[PDB]
Write a protein that binds this ligand. Structure first.
Ligand SMILES: [Zn+2]
Ligand SMILES: [Zn+2]
Lengths: 365, 163, 365, 163
DNA sequence: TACAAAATTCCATGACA
DNA sequence: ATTGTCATGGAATTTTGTA
DNA sequence: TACAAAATTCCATGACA
DNA sequence: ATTGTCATGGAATTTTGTA
């Protein structure tokens, strides 16, 4: 209807004059530098874009190149982009091409026993009937307790931490959302003692980074001791524990033990610098050491990062994606931005989820 | 010669036998000479073995320079003697019959037995589960001298469970 | 013996005067800014370094900080480094902190059928009794043949390529060292037809990158078609094949099909630009297109890269490392440097291995 | 109107029945109108079905604009008619009894039958395994006109197996 | 007020999930 | 509802013994 | 000979093993 | 004996219709 005026040589907003618009086969055509292209009517154009796209569900540029073979019209891409935004399938399947903003470096806990980080290593080769190691790191000091267990079970976690909290009781225990810690039995054990439980966003081990990093060293040392020998790790845990708690961090220039106690015990190469201070002078020299510790800052953002705005459309990564099925969930709205790397989304559909942006992508278009 | 410090000396003793809880009969008692911090380990016998198994737990945290004890058969044994020579711990023994500790340790070691008795009565079969609650209470207990809990002297901060 | 002269106040190369060297407990001691440290005799020093190191097998700085508690002597680190170089255990267990130099971008094959890249996808969910897809990409064009199979077996690879080479015969078939292609039955099948077999270095899929990348797209499209539906992928392969061979690479601005045939078949949105040229004009316009294609260059080297020198000590990554065992093999000599990213090593011990530097680390020290 | 091109027209025919090889009896023959390139597919019957199953293989590579055939029951069927309407292929039929191809196709389609016979004799039971070797030979065979192998006209380069 | 070498700090790289 | 970490060993930088 | 917007190119990001 | 690749969609850059 609107293409009537055109053939006559009357101007229409978006249709560049200087190209002659003619008629053949009862289709409107145009001579363009690229060649001679059919101009479809308005109503036909959505149908066309969709057909072109659906051949192999291609992106902007790929989808256009197909269409531009036969057709021309004003602002072609605008129309293509409109479809790619409404393609249920491309949305939930295509990967991201935007990386999450720079990570946060949460302030080191102030006092020992302010925060514990906990995790299970394993399963390992059966040693003496044990398969897993419970690992507990004090946030402030990096002091570490190891307990061999037969299962990553609440039951065994409780047994192990009962022995631990005979020394002292933490304010906060931070763990991943693994079944062993998200149980209601654990919450109670914790409530009784006045310990606050705190959980990482789901599927983001970086949040448990202090334990996870310590997991590495535990394993790497066990490995070194076990070379040649069969993997008898049960008897080794204590030695490892002790060895690790008494090792210097070249950055801090202190061992976890030192940060925890303020003097070396009777271990090899025990430091004697504070041998003349009364316990009291020593204990305040310690408070001085503990607050002066090196604290890392956040790194520069990469060229093509994104950050979460409230009300943004956003998609959560499918956790355990089955073979040949989409790697992403359907779109979700951002509800609150708890910090530049953590977000509350209205999900599927709909509960509140608290998630790391590393498991997020911005719905494109 | 130089001022007294944590891990300089560990005073150890056996308490028992007690009414059986969870198949245990004895409590090994380790108090730190300087701070008064207390570790408690339930054992099944006052044997060298039970002591070593228990002290292996403690020495994953810290090793004392000296362990002081009475001339109990368990500590006078040469197995225990060899154990301590390995970890480089000097063994030190009180005279037979005249068992001396620190002024502060005697005070502390007395507190334990009385605290144990007060909480044994009523639940004599169930003292095992309580050892942590006990251990915690002792270490966060105000000392007439210094007015510092053992906890405070060991860690140099305040605890999250005061008494 | 050599520490006699010192106490008397006679100079020794490496022992800074201005600090007074005295005697206690029949050990030589020195007053230093840091404090008062024992100077052990020459013969005792290796013994010491080793003990310090062996506590938890620590690196340079960590190992020194232990030692420096009690002792001092000239060029302490030199001695530490000497040990870390001879620690069998640290060598084969510690990770690298040097990244491999920038990747190579091998020139695109000149003609179609010059080189085929081949790989198996799977296993997948059983569809019609089939579990794997054999994937064959022409290096030059990126044209792709798909064949469903029940096993990644030589047997089935041969069946499938017999149908393929009815069209034409390649010069070179490039594959990974997977059992299906490294069999002697395959070598013969290939020899008969005058096809040269060519293999990626072991455990380096980047070398089969053309297929591997195409594996991705095959899977991503199958996924998109299968949303909602059960995973009936058997019937889809043809459509996928066709859909993919006829999709534009926004960089090339051509479809694989176009590069292979030089005109579009009777598919949707088929390009008509060369409708007036004789087949002959067209066929030379094609030769022009094929040589003008965009070719990527190698990226800048990262700050802390390394490159292989002949005679360098070098270690190959343990392929399928068992739980708790070293992630690296014992040291190996570089024999020839086939190119900046590929190396011949004298191995374990000793055969010639050809390996990618991505599976290599420089033995440190 | 415009110069003849690959994929403009596909000439198809059935050869058979032949002595059974690998349980097959027939060869479907597809020659490209313009280049003379030849595809061969072994079938078990000259049925619509066998044709469709076979042509599904070919049309994963390229789809012709037109298929030309004789009025064989297999190609005149409405199943086959629907198959081709779907892929947007125009069907074109020669007169009954007067079966016309291209000058070049007649030449080529004759070559095939003679080549098939020469290599059938001696191994009549084993012609299946040879279809690739046959197909290859035809497509890399020099044409008196153009002096271009079908291969060359289709791909615009030279093959690695000349004859 | 200045040098070569040692001692110390910097920091990219990779592995823990 | 919460959040990455840090041993390691060449290289870069600063300090040191002596003048 | 210069403008705003469209059309095109650039290119980091991530997934295939 | 051999070797990374390339769709994707915001951003950066270049071209275009009109003056
Ligand atoms: Zn789509
Ligand atoms: Zn070592």
């Amino acid at each position: 209807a609107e293409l009537d005026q055109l053939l006559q040589g009357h101007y229409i907003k978006g249709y560049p004059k200087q190209y002659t618009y003619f008629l053949e086969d009862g289709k409107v055509k145009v001579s363009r530098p690229e060649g001679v292209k059919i101009i479809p009517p308005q109503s036909d154009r959505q149908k066309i874009v969709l057909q072109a796209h659906n051949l192999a569900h291609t992106g902007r540029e790929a989808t256009l190149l197909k269409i531009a073979n036969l057709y021309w019209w004003p602002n072609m891409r605008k129309d293509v982009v409109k479809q790619l935004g409404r393609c249920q399938q491309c949305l939930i399947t295509n990967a991201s091409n935007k990386a999450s903003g720079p990570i946060l470096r949460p302030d080191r806990p102030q006092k020992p026993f302010d925060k514990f980080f906990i995790d299970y290593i394993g399963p390992l080769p059966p040693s003496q009937g044990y398969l897993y190691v419970l690992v507990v790191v004090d946030g402030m000091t990096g002091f570490t307790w190891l307990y061999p267990t037969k299962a990553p079970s609440t039951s065994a976690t409780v047994k192990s931490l009962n022995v631990l909290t005979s020394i002292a009781i933490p304010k906060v225990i931070h763990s991943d959302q693994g079944a062993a810690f998200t149980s209601s039995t654990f919450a109670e054990w914790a409530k009784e003692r006045g310990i606050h439980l705190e959980f990482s966003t789901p599927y983001h081990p970086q949040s448990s980074g202090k334990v996870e990093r310590k997991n590495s060293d535990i394993k790497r040392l066990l490995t070194k001791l076990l070379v040649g020998r069969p993997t008898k790790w049960y008897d080794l845990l204590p030695v490892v524990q002790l060895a690790l708690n008494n090792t210097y961090s070249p950055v801090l220039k202190y061992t976890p033990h030192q940060l925890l106690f303020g003097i070396d015990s009777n271990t090899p190469f025990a430091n004697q610098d504070t041998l003349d201070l009364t316990r009291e002078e020593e204990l305040s020299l310690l408070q001085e050491i503990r607050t002066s510790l090196y604290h890392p800052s956040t790194p520069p953002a990469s060229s093509r990062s994104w950050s979460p705005v409230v009300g943004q459309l956003v998609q959560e990564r499918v956790a355990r994606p089955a073979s040949l099925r989409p790697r992403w969930h359907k779109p979700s709205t951002v509800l609150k931005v708890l910090n530049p790397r953590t977000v509350v989304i209205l999900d599927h559909l709909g509960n509140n989820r608290t998630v790391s942006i590393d498991n997020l992508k911005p719905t494109s278009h | 010669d130089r001022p007294q410090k944590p891990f300089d000396k560990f005073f150890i003793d056996y308490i028992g036998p007690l009414p059986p809880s969870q198949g245990y009969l004895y409590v090994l008692v380790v108090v730190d000479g300087m701070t008064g911090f207390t570790w408690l380990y339930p054992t099944k016998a006052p044997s060298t073995s039970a002591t070593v198994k228990s002290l292996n737990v403690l020495t994953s945290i810290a090793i004392p320079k000296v362990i002081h004890s009475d001339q109990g058969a368990a500590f006078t044994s040469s197995t225990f003697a060899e154990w301590a020579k390995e970890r480089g711990i000097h063994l030190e023994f009180s005279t037979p019959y005249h068992p001396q500790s620190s002024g502060k340790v005697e005070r502390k070691n007395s507190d334990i037995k009385r605290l144990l008795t007060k909480l044994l009565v009523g639940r004599p079969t169930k003292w095992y589960d309580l050892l942590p609650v006990v251990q915690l209470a002792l270490n966060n207990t105000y000392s007439p001298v210094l007015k510092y809990t053992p906890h405070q002297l060991l860690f140099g901060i305040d605890s999250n469970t005061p008494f």
